[model samples]
Target: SKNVVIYADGVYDMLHLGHMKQLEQAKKLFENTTLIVGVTSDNETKLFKGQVVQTLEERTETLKHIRWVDEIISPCPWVVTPEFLEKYKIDYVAHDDIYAWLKRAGKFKATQRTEGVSTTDLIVRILKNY
Candidate 1:
């Protein structure tokens, strides 16, 4: 059987070690899995997360360089709708356990998040340093 596709969506504004670990963990969940990542839009990140240091183009480019991501879905929504699953043929939608709103698919699955490191952690460090 051809391996099913696994999907994960995020802002991915700042490239970090934790993100790498998250991707690694998500891919480990299935056999011969294809990892499809969705990068949220610049506007979306701005409206919700204040200012983003990286533009959407730059953000996705960084993800492109990551070894584990197979495809980039640009301007991705915060929630993975049923329409998205059908459009992309996603078998599982990987996410952190707390995002109750992302419970939009039959294949929705949860992944472990690196507790201590995140975009917020990076920003806090910069704010203090500067």
Candidate 2:
């Protein structure tokens, strides 16, 4: 059987519906696909995207429950490198943001982020209520 390997990297902080939908779309991007999702390290999140609601371990655990996910990579690379792609045999990258090299190589697939709901939105609601 032929299977295309797709890599989707994210902070995955809140584990919301948005994340699930995105993963679902990525898995369905190709008829036969092995979806590899990467949850960034806590250090990486703090360095690049500020503090996160969930730890790397917790995020990874959540991803394990997602039916669309085939494999999980913890402490995922902050920037995807050609070497890394070669090592993983990633055929395409799926995410909301466009990776320049992935796009240049015609190996990037875009996923639409669910609007009106995000970790920040959730946090704001919590603060308002509590």
Which candidate number would show the highest TM-score if scored against the true structure?
A: 2
* Count of clashing pairs, candidate 1: 0
Best by lDDT: 2
Please give, for residues 1-130, the per-residue lDDT of candidate 1 as tens digits: 5797989888886878788888887777777889999988888778877787898888899999888899889878866667877899888888774345446435767777676687778778889976
Q: Which ten residues in a row have the lowest lDDT in candidate 1?
A: 97-106
Q: What local lDDT does model 2 show for residue 114?
A: 90
- How close to the true structure is residue 91 of candidate 1, measured as C-alpha lDDT? 86
Candidate 2 lDDT over 14-127, as tens digits, reads 788889999999999878999999889999789888988788888899889999999998989999988989999999999864388789999899998897677678779889
lDDT of each: 0.80, 0.90
- What is the Cα-based lDDT of residue 88 in candidate 1? 92
Model 2 scores what on Cα lDDT?
Answer: 0.90
